[PDB]
Design a protein around this nucleic acid. Structure first.
Ligand SMILES: [K+]
Ligand SMILES: [Sm+3]
Ligand SMILES: [Sm+3]
Ligand SMILES: [Sm+3]
Ligand SMILES: [Sm+3]
Ligand SMILES: [Sm+3]
Ligand SMILES: [Sm+3]
Ligand SMILES: [Sm+3]
Ligand SMILES: [Sm+3]
Length: 341
DNA sequence: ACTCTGCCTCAAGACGGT
DNA sequence: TGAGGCAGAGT
DNA sequence: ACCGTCC
């Protein structure tokens, strides 16, 4: 994530945000950050503070959400490809070590809530410790295969590979809630694309070209601004927030020039600042090759889906069968069968 | 006045019968 | 892998 | 649309 970027764009670059009705997206392809989607389901899909599960004690909240949300998108003619995280970049090792502290610190506090018979504090440290395991990813990949929905393994950060799929024109936008994708150069970011029937927030498109235009920056200058706002890969400058960062970038263009012209006593920079390495990461990240795999939306395997979701994971057979039928019908409406010449 | 930091909290999905 | 709200301090 | 329920 980029600290405050969403608010900054709304304040100084409003024309980069465009809203459209769900009906206008029939036939459009999008890339989804699968790991983020799983994380959201593990936190939100709960009954009595506990994730859904089968009698064997196996979590099914992530399968619940991925099954029904994916079908809803396809019913609206939206064809998603799910991108799974790979090995994180080394620059993130600092941010991850921090996530270990707040995790061990959150573990340090879950017991005192349970021991003292806490009421609603147990459910808080529970959610705080949610983490997507490789079993979660493998089960979702398994589900998507049976649903006929394509997925991809990113070599590193999924958001970077999503951005690369948009750049190559293999999907229209990266559908996620983190502004990371824009810093990785995604031409289009889409927010609030759940295709739910609730419909509370409007579908928002963030267009990078409009952002660069209203801020008067090129991409490398935009990346330096995001570094000054605050990223996951390096430190920012204390006392430099969104208002001053924009002014400094617009005036000095680069972080290097900002340092040379900054007053060490007023605004000292971090010691051994890795802004140059984070700069290279955002602009030239390790990403999948968009030309390798041709994305295909295939017929779902209904009977295997029943065996897996119902027989093993104990979903309602009526609901799963109904869902598979809706998915097959919606794919037939939005997708052309393969042709040979 | 404007700006930034560090606290606080609050939320975080979807189906289907009504 | 948050977003606002608020008080207090720096500019 | 609300809300009990999903697993
Ligand atoms: K800062
Ligand atoms: Sm990110
Ligand atoms: Sm419980
Ligand atoms: Sm089992
Ligand atoms: Sm620390
Ligand atoms: Sm990631
Ligand atoms: Sm990520
Ligand atoms: Sm992100
Ligand atoms: Sm079993």
């Amino acid at each position: 994530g980029i600290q405050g970027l969403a608010k900054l764009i709304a304040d100084v670059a409003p024309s980069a945000i465009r809203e459209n009705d769900i009906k206008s997206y029939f036939g459009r392809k999008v890339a989804i950050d699968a790991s983020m989607s799983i994380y959201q389901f593990l936190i939100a899909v709960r009954q009595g503070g506990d994730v859904l599960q089968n009698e064997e004690g196996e979590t099914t909240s992530h399968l619940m959400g991925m099954f029904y949300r994916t079908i809803r998108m396809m019913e609206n003619g939206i064809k998603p490809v799910y991108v799974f995280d790979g090995k994180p970049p080394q620059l993130k090792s600092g941010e991850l070590a921090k996530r270990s502290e707040r995790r061990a610190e959150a573990e340090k506090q879950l017991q005192q809530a349970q021991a003292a018979g806490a009421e609603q504090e147990v459910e808080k440290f529970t959610k705080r410790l949610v983490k997507v395991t490789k079993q979660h990813n493998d089960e979702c990949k398994h589900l998507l295969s049976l649903m006929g929905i394509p997925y991809l393994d990113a070599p590193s950060e999924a958001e970077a590979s999503c951005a690369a799929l948009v750049k190559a024109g293999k999907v229209y936008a990266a559908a996620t809630e983190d502004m990371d994708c824009l810093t990785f150069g995604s031409p289009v970011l889409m927010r609030h694309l759940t295709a739910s029937e609730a419909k509370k927030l409007p579908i928002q498109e963030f267009h990078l070209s409009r952002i660069l235009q209203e801020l008067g920056l090129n991409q490398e200058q935009f990346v330096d601004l995001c570094i000054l706002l605050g990223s996951n890969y390096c430190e920012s400058i204390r006392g430099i927030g969104p208002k001053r960062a924009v002014d400094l970038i617009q005036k000095h263009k680069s972080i290097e020039e900002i340092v040379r012209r900054l007053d060490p006593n007023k605004y000292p920079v971090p010691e051994n600042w890795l802004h140059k390495e984070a700069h290279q990461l955002f602009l030239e990240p390790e990403v999948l090759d968009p030309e390798s795999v041709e994305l295909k939306w295939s017929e779902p395997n209904e009977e295997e889906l029943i065996k897996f979701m119902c027989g093993e994971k104990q979903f309602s057979e009526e609901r799963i069968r109904s869902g598979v039928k809706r998915l097959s019908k919606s794919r037939q409406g939005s997708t052309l069968e393969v042709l040979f010449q």
